[PDB]
Amino acid sequence: MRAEALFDFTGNSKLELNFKAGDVIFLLSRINKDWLEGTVRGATGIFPLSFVKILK
């Protein structure tokens, strides 16, 4: 599925997915209850579920 970012998320590590509010993320899977793995802006990485709205 996909998720629309609600807030900007600037990760510290290259393992974390960077994005800005309004970006639509192509989800890859849940890594745990509070985090997702997804793709956007040419990169892949993990990010907090609470920073996006799942489009479903």
Coordinates of all heavy atoms in Angstrom, one line a residue, unseen atoms left out:
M1 N 0.9 -1.2 0.0 CA 0.0 0.0 0.0 C 0.9 1.3 0.0 O 2.1 1.2 -0.3 CB -0.9 0.0 1.2 CG -1.7 -1.3 1.4 SD -3.1 -1.2 2.5 CE -4.4 -0.8 1.3
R2 N 0.3 2.4 0.3 CA 1.0 3.7 0.3 C 0.6 4.5 1.6 O -0.4 4.3 2.2 CB 0.8 4.5 -0.9 CG 1.3 3.8 -2.2 CD 1.0 4.7 -3.4 NE 0.6 3.9 -4.5 CZ 1.2 2.9 -5.1 NH1 2.4 2.6 -4.7 NH2 0.7 2.2 -6.1
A3 N 1.5 5.4 1.9 CA 1.3 6.3 3.0 C 1.6 7.8 2.7 O 2.6 8.0 2.0 CB 2.1 5.9 4.2
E4 N 0.8 8.7 3.1 CA 1.1 10.1 2.8 C 1.8 10.7 4.1 O 1.2 10.6 5.2 CB -0.2 10.9 2.5 CG 0.1 12.3 2.1 CD -1.2 13.1 1.6 OE1 -2.3 12.5 1.7 OE2 -1.1 14.2 1.2
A5 N 3.0 11.3 4.0 CA 3.6 11.9 5.1 C 2.9 13.1 5.7 O 2.4 13.9 4.9 CB 5.1 12.3 4.7
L6 N 2.7 13.1 7.0 CA 2.0 14.2 7.7 C 3.0 15.2 8.2 O 2.7 16.4 8.2 CB 1.1 13.7 8.8 CG 0.0 12.8 8.4 CD1 -0.7 12.2 9.5 CD2 -1.0 13.7 7.5
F7 N 4.1 14.8 8.6 CA 5.2 15.6 9.1 C 6.5 15.3 8.4 O 6.6 14.2 7.8 CB 5.4 15.3 10.6 CG 4.1 15.5 11.4 CD1 3.3 14.4 11.7 CD2 3.7 16.8 11.8 CE1 2.1 14.6 12.4 CE2 2.5 16.9 12.5 CZ 1.7 15.8 12.8
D8 N 7.4 16.2 8.4 CA 8.7 15.9 7.8 C 9.4 14.9 8.7 O 9.3 15.0 10.0 CB 9.6 17.2 7.7 CG 9.0 18.2 6.8 OD1 7.9 17.9 6.2 OD2 9.7 19.2 6.5
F9 N 10.2 14.0 8.2 CA 11.0 13.1 9.0 C 12.4 13.1 8.5 O 12.7 12.7 7.4 CB 10.4 11.6 8.9 CG 11.2 10.7 9.7 CD1 11.3 10.8 11.1 CD2 11.9 9.6 9.1 CE1 12.1 9.9 11.9 CE2 12.7 8.7 9.9 CZ 12.8 8.9 11.2
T10 N 13.3 13.6 9.3 CA 14.7 13.6 9.0 C 15.4 12.6 9.9 O 15.4 12.7 11.1 CB 15.3 15.0 9.3 OG1 14.6 16.0 8.5 CG2 16.8 15.0 9.0
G11 N 15.8 11.5 9.3 CA 16.5 10.5 10.0 C 18.0 10.8 10.2 O 18.5 11.6 9.5
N12 N 18.6 10.2 11.2 CA 20.0 10.5 11.4 C 20.8 9.5 10.6 O 21.8 9.9 10.0 CB 20.3 10.2 12.9 CG 19.3 10.9 13.8 OD1 18.6 10.3 14.7 ND2 19.1 12.2 13.6
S13 N 20.4 8.3 10.5 CA 21.1 7.2 9.8 C 20.6 7.0 8.3 O 19.4 7.4 8.0 CB 20.9 5.9 10.5 OG 21.3 4.8 9.7
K14 N 21.4 6.5 7.5 CA 21.0 6.3 6.1 C 20.0 5.1 6.1 O 19.4 4.8 5.0 CB 22.3 6.0 5.2 CG 23.1 4.8 5.6 CD 24.0 4.3 4.5 CE 23.2 3.9 3.2 NZ 24.1 3.5 2.0
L15 N 19.9 4.4 7.2 CA 18.9 3.3 7.3 C 17.5 3.9 7.5 O 16.5 3.2 7.2 CB 19.2 2.4 8.5 CG 20.5 1.6 8.3 CD1 20.7 0.6 9.5 CD2 20.5 0.7 7.0
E16 N 17.4 5.1 7.9 CA 16.1 5.8 8.1 C 15.7 6.5 6.8 O 16.5 7.1 6.2 CB 16.1 6.7 9.3 CG 16.2 5.9 10.6 CD 16.5 6.8 11.8 OE1 17.3 7.8 11.7 OE2 16.0 6.5 12.9
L17 N 14.4 6.4 6.5 CA 13.9 7.0 5.3 C 13.5 8.5 5.5 O 12.7 8.8 6.3 CB 12.6 6.3 4.8 CG 12.0 6.9 3.6 CD1 12.9 6.7 2.4 CD2 10.6 6.2 3.3
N18 N 14.2 9.4 4.8 CA 13.9 10.8 4.9 C 12.7 11.2 4.0 O 12.6 10.7 2.8 CB 15.1 11.6 4.4 CG 16.2 11.7 5.5 OD1 16.2 10.9 6.5 ND2 17.0 12.8 5.4
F19 N 11.9 12.1 4.4 CA 10.8 12.6 3.6 C 10.2 13.8 4.2 O 10.5 14.2 5.3 CB 9.7 11.5 3.5 CG 9.1 10.9 4.8 CD1 8.2 11.7 5.5 CD2 9.5 9.7 5.3 CE1 7.6 11.1 6.7 CE2 9.0 9.2 6.4 CZ 8.0 9.9 7.1
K20 N 9.3 14.5 3.4 CA 8.7 15.7 3.8 C 7.2 15.5 3.8 O 6.7 14.7 3.1 CB 9.0 16.9 2.8 CG 10.5 17.2 2.8 CD 10.8 18.2 1.6 CE 12.3 18.4 1.4 NZ 12.5 19.2 0.2
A21 N 6.5 16.3 4.6 CA 5.1 16.3 4.7 C 4.5 16.3 3.3 O 4.9 17.2 2.5 CB 4.5 17.4 5.6
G22 N 3.5 15.5 3.0 CA 2.9 15.5 1.7 C 3.5 14.5 0.7 O 2.9 14.2 -0.3
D23 N 4.7 13.9 1.0 CA 5.3 12.9 0.2 C 4.4 11.7 0.3 O 3.8 11.5 1.3 CB 6.7 12.5 0.6 CG 7.7 13.5 0.2 OD1 7.5 14.3 -0.8 OD2 8.8 13.5 0.7
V24 N 4.3 10.9 -0.8 CA 3.6 9.6 -0.7 C 4.6 8.5 -0.8 O 5.4 8.4 -1.7 CB 2.6 9.5 -1.9 CG1 1.9 8.1 -1.8 CG2 1.5 10.6 -1.8
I25 N 4.6 7.7 0.3 CA 5.6 6.6 0.4 C 5.1 5.3 0.0 O 3.9 4.9 0.3 CB 6.0 6.5 1.9 CG1 6.5 7.9 2.4 CG2 7.1 5.5 2.1 CD1 6.4 8.0 3.9
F26 N 5.9 4.6 -0.8 CA 5.6 3.2 -1.3 C 6.0 2.3 -0.2 O 7.2 2.1 0.0 CB 6.3 3.0 -2.6 CG 6.2 1.6 -3.1 CD1 5.0 1.0 -3.4 CD2 7.4 0.8 -3.3 CE1 4.9 -0.3 -3.8 CE2 7.3 -0.5 -3.7 CZ 6.1 -1.1 -4.0
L27 N 5.1 1.7 0.5 CA 5.4 0.8 1.6 C 6.0 -0.5 1.2 O 5.6 -1.1 0.2 CB 4.2 0.6 2.5 CG 3.6 1.9 3.1 CD1 2.4 1.6 4.0 CD2 4.7 2.6 3.9
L28 N 6.9 -1.0 2.0 CA 7.6 -2.3 1.8 C 7.1 -3.4 2.8 O 7.0 -4.5 2.5 CB 9.1 -2.2 1.7 CG 9.6 -1.4 0.5 CD1 11.0 -0.8 0.8 CD2 9.6 -2.3 -0.7
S29 N 6.9 -2.9 4.1 CA 6.5 -3.8 5.1 C 6.7 -3.1 6.5 O 7.3 -2.1 6.7 CB 7.4 -5.1 5.1 OG 8.8 -4.8 5.4
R30 N 6.1 -3.8 7.5 CA 6.2 -3.3 8.9 C 7.4 -4.0 9.5 O 7.6 -5.2 9.3 CB 4.9 -3.8 9.7 CG 3.7 -2.9 9.6 CD 2.8 -3.2 10.8 NE 1.5 -2.4 10.8 CZ 0.6 -2.6 9.9 NH1 0.6 -3.6 9.0 NH2 -0.6 -1.9 10.0
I31 N 8.3 -3.2 10.1 CA 9.4 -3.8 10.7 C 9.1 -4.1 12.2 O 9.8 -5.0 12.8 CB 10.7 -2.8 10.6 CG1 10.4 -1.5 11.3 CG2 11.0 -2.6 9.2 CD1 11.6 -0.6 11.4
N32 N 8.2 -3.4 12.8 CA 7.7 -3.6 14.1 C 6.4 -2.7 14.2 O 6.1 -2.0 13.3 CB 8.8 -3.2 15.2 CG 9.1 -1.7 15.2 OD1 8.3 -0.9 15.4 ND2 10.4 -1.4 14.9
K33 N 5.7 -2.8 15.4 CA 4.5 -2.1 15.6 C 4.5 -0.6 15.3 O 3.5 0.0 14.8 CB 3.9 -2.3 17.0
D34 N 5.6 0.1 15.7 CA 5.7 1.5 15.5 C 6.5 2.0 14.2 O 6.6 3.2 14.0 CB 6.4 2.2 16.7 CG 5.5 2.0 18.0 OD1 4.3 2.3 17.9 OD2 6.1 1.6 19.0
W35 N 7.1 1.0 13.5 CA 7.9 1.4 12.3 C 7.6 0.7 11.0 O 7.3 -0.5 11.0 CB 9.4 1.3 12.7 CG 9.9 2.3 13.7 CD1 9.5 2.2 15.0 CD2 10.7 3.4 13.5 NE1 10.2 3.3 15.7 CE2 10.9 4.0 14.8 CE3 11.4 3.9 12.4 CZ2 11.7 5.1 15.0 CZ3 12.2 5.0 12.6 CH2 12.4 5.6 13.9
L36 N 7.8 1.4 9.9 CA 7.6 0.8 8.6 C 8.9 1.0 7.7 O 9.7 1.8 8.0 CB 6.5 1.5 7.9 CG 5.1 1.0 8.0 CD1 4.7 0.6 9.4 CD2 4.1 2.1 7.5
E37 N 8.9 0.2 6.7 CA 10.0 0.2 5.7 C 9.3 0.7 4.5 O 8.2 0.2 4.2 CB 10.6 -1.2 5.5 CG 11.8 -1.2 4.6 CD 13.1 -1.1 5.3 OE1 13.2 -0.4 6.3 OE2 14.1 -1.8 4.9
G38 N 9.9 1.7 3.8 CA 9.2 2.2 2.6 C 10.2 2.8 1.6 O 11.4 2.9 2.0
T39 N 9.7 3.2 0.5 CA 10.5 3.9 -0.5 C 9.9 5.2 -1.0 O 8.7 5.2 -1.3 CB 10.6 2.9 -1.8 OG1 11.3 1.7 -1.5 CG2 11.3 3.7 -2.9
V40 N 10.7 6.2 -1.1 CA 10.3 7.5 -1.6 C 11.6 8.3 -1.9 O 12.6 8.0 -1.3 CB 9.4 8.3 -0.6 CG1 10.3 8.7 0.6 CG2 8.8 9.5 -1.2
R41 N 11.5 9.3 -2.8 CA 12.6 10.2 -3.1 C 13.9 9.4 -3.6 O 15.0 9.8 -3.3 CB 13.0 11.1 -2.0 CG 12.0 12.2 -1.7 CD 12.2 12.9 -0.4 NE 11.2 13.9 -0.2 CZ 11.1 15.1 -0.8 NH1 11.9 15.4 -1.8 NH2 10.1 15.9 -0.6
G42 N 13.7 8.2 -4.2 CA 14.8 7.4 -4.7 C 15.5 6.6 -3.6 O 16.5 6.0 -3.9
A43 N 15.0 6.6 -2.4 CA 15.6 5.9 -1.3 C 14.7 5.0 -0.6 O 13.5 5.1 -0.7 CB 16.3 6.9 -0.4
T44 N 15.3 4.1 0.2 CA 14.5 3.1 1.0 C 15.0 3.2 2.4 O 16.2 3.6 2.6 CB 14.7 1.7 0.5 OG1 14.3 1.6 -0.9 CG2 13.8 0.7 1.3
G45 N 14.2 2.9 3.4 CA 14.6 3.0 4.8 C 13.4 2.8 5.7 O 12.3 2.7 5.3
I46 N 13.7 2.9 7.0 CA 12.6 2.8 8.0 C 12.2 4.1 8.5 O 12.9 5.1 8.4 CB 13.1 1.9 9.2 CG1 13.9 2.7 10.2 CG2 13.9 0.7 8.7 CD1 14.4 1.9 11.3
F47 N 10.9 4.2 9.0 CA 10.4 5.5 9.5 C 9.3 5.2 10.4 O 8.7 4.1 10.4 CB 10.0 6.4 8.3 CG 8.8 5.8 7.5 CD1 7.5 5.9 7.8 CD2 9.1 5.0 6.3 CE1 6.5 5.4 7.1 CE2 8.1 4.5 5.6 CZ 6.8 4.6 6.0
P48 N 8.9 6.2 11.3 CA 7.8 6.0 12.3 C 6.5 6.1 11.6 O 6.2 7.0 10.9 CB 8.1 7.2 13.2 CG 9.5 7.6 13.0 CD 9.7 7.4 11.5
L49 N 5.6 5.1 12.0 CA 4.3 5.0 11.4 C 3.5 6.2 11.8 O 2.6 6.6 11.0 CB 3.6 3.7 12.0 CG 2.1 3.5 11.7 CD1 1.9 3.4 10.2 CD2 1.6 2.3 12.5
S50 N 3.7 6.8 12.9 CA 3.0 8.0 13.4 C 3.3 9.3 12.6 O 2.6 10.3 12.9 CB 3.3 8.2 14.9 OG 4.6 8.8 15.1
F51 N 4.2 9.2 11.7 CA 4.5 10.4 10.9 C 3.8 10.4 9.5 O 3.9 11.3 8.8 CB 6.0 10.5 10.6 CG 6.8 11.0 11.8 CD1 6.6 10.4 13.1 CD2 7.7 12.0 11.7 CE1 7.3 10.8 14.2 CE2 8.4 12.5 12.8 CZ 8.2 11.9 14.0
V52 N 3.0 9.4 9.3 CA 2.2 9.2 8.0 C 0.8 8.7 8.2 O 0.5 8.2 9.3 CB 2.9 8.2 7.1 CG1 4.4 8.6 6.9 CG2 2.7 6.8 7.6
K53 N 0.0 8.8 7.2 CA -1.3 8.3 7.2 C -1.3 7.3 6.1 O -1.0 7.5 5.0 CB -2.3 9.5 6.8 CG -3.7 9.3 7.3 CD -4.6 8.4 6.5 CE -6.0 8.5 7.0 NZ -6.6 7.2 7.2
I54 N -1.7 6.0 6.5 CA -1.8 5.0 5.5 C -2.9 5.2 4.6 O -4.1 5.3 5.1 CB -1.9 3.6 6.2 CG1 -0.8 3.3 7.2 CG2 -2.0 2.5 5.2 CD1 0.6 3.2 6.5
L55 N -2.7 5.1 3.3 CA -3.8 5.3 2.3 C -4.4 3.9 2.0 O -3.9 3.2 1.2 CB -3.2 5.9 1.0 CG -2.6 7.3 1.3 CD1 -1.9 7.8 0.0 CD2 -3.7 8.3 1.7
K56 N -5.5 3.6 2.7 CA -6.2 2.4 2.6 C -7.7 2.6 2.9 O -8.5 1.8 2.5 CB -5.6 1.3 3.5 CG -5.9 1.5 5.0 CD -5.2 0.4 5.8 CE -5.4 0.7 7.3 NZ -6.6 0.0 7.9

